[PDB]
């Protein structure tokens, strides 16, 4: 309990931004402006969660140790705004659930995750990753898992799990475009491999660039990565890219319909048609139905959904 205040800080990539805080003796990373609040915690290099609600003596967040917290807090706010403004959705559950994030998780931890209840961000080892909350697509990817878990409930294995992952990359990217800094169709480029320019974890525009399939005939069928959830997601990421941006892929031509309509179609599919066990063929059907609901059965939008899924062999 305290009074809402506005702090200032520097994020992982060195940019200054304002952050919404709460004052009660200390200034806490607690944003009361969005739903039931956005709360950012210090995990203090340990794996106990959530850790301590982030406290600061002066409401200025320019220390090196502060940067991952500033970005986890700020980009959760951006993500909240995207869902509210674009999709009329109030937080991940649709009922303004509090959004909780922990930073400084463990030592040298080269990942981030939604744990069923909150977001968690490693600092990276400084070679593979820098602190992972520095990437707006990463923050939005993880918070999108919460959305999925409350809605379609896609099981984290095999084709359902690859859809789960792709939904997170799709909305992660749409949020990155909403914020409009340096948007692209790549995943994690701002925090991956600080020694190497121009790479990323995954690509939506060309998944094969990083060894991921861009066609159903190239799907991974083994047991690694929960049946390739971060690998086979490339097939869906490519379809989504094609629906938005257009192109000819394996000789199948897709007329792009743009990002806003992509987001509308997939948000509707996610929230009205997908189920925990949906597979790729079922996703196609859900996307075709959603586009039909939104734009009509004779629409270009529907035609493009069908061409995009044809192009990737679904
Ligand atoms: N988030 C992906 C890629 C990160 C790999 C980090 N070492 C995964 O959990 O598989
Ligand atoms: C690192 C991040 C984008 C995610 N947890 C994987 O993929
Ligand atoms: Ca301070
Ligand atoms: Ca970018
Ligand atoms: Ca990106
Ligand atoms: Ca890099
Ligand atoms: Zn994920």
Author numbering: 2 to 315
From the paper:
ARP/wARP was then run for automatic model building. Both models were completed manually using Coot interspersed with refinement with REFMAC5.
